[PDB]
Design a protein around this ligand. Structure first.
Ligand SMILES: Cc1cc2c(=O)n(CCN3C(=O)c4ccccc4S3(=O)=O)nnc2s1
Length: 167
């Protein structure tokens, strides 16, 4: 039993809710919140911009030190950093950005990072400003993630479409 509330159950391990991931993390304080990161951990917009703003830019400060030490992530890769005031940890995961021409096949590799954590609060990878089809992102999530994932979808119209079209 966990404290995630109001989710629809899609499969044995995947749950979904029309919610603002910033507000969900602030309420639940999950062990792991997933950020929709880029390889430079430049948290400018979309989910990353919102998560970072909620940390008063502390996420960006920590991320800049991480990049200065380690260099950029790989598309499809991830790193674990602090969750600041939102969660114990933040798993920064890089899904492919379609508006950069990146290989959508890398979306499965991106979701594989979730399997290293027993429970996560997450957005749909490569959705929003990353330019992929969210119905496809949900499909890849369900077919790749085996650990317990709680998906927050900001847009109510999209959530209904994802639910209604979910096979
Ligand atoms: C605070 C934040 C949550 C969040 C999120 O959940 N996503 C993934 C789901 N969405 C889309 O694919 C999408 C496409 C067109 C318009 C609106 C949306 S959407 O509902 O935001 N993307 N960006 C953000 S920014």
């Amino acid at each position: 039993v966990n404290s995630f509330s109001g989710y629809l159950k899609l499969t044995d391990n995947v749950y979904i809710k029309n919610a603002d991931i910033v507000e969900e993390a602030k309420k639940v304080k999950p062990t792991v919140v997933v950020n929709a990161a880029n390889v430079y951990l430049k948290h400018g917009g979309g989910v990353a911009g919102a998560l970072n703003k909620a940390t008063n830019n502390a996420m960006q400060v920590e991320s800049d030190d991480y990049i200065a030490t380690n260099g950029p992530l790989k598309v499809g890769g991830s790193c674990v950093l602090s969750g600041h005031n939102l969660a114990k940890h933040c798993l920064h995961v890089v899904g492919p950005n379609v508006n950069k021409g990146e290989d959508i096949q890398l979306l499965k590799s991106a979701y594989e990072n979730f399997n290293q954590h027993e429970v996560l609060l997450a957005p749909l990878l490569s959705a929003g400003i990353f330019g992929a089809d969210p119905i496809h992102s949900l499909r890849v999530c369900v077919d790749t993630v085996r650990t317990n994932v709680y998906l927050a979808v900001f847009d109510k119209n999209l959530y209904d479409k994802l639910v209604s079209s979910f096979l």
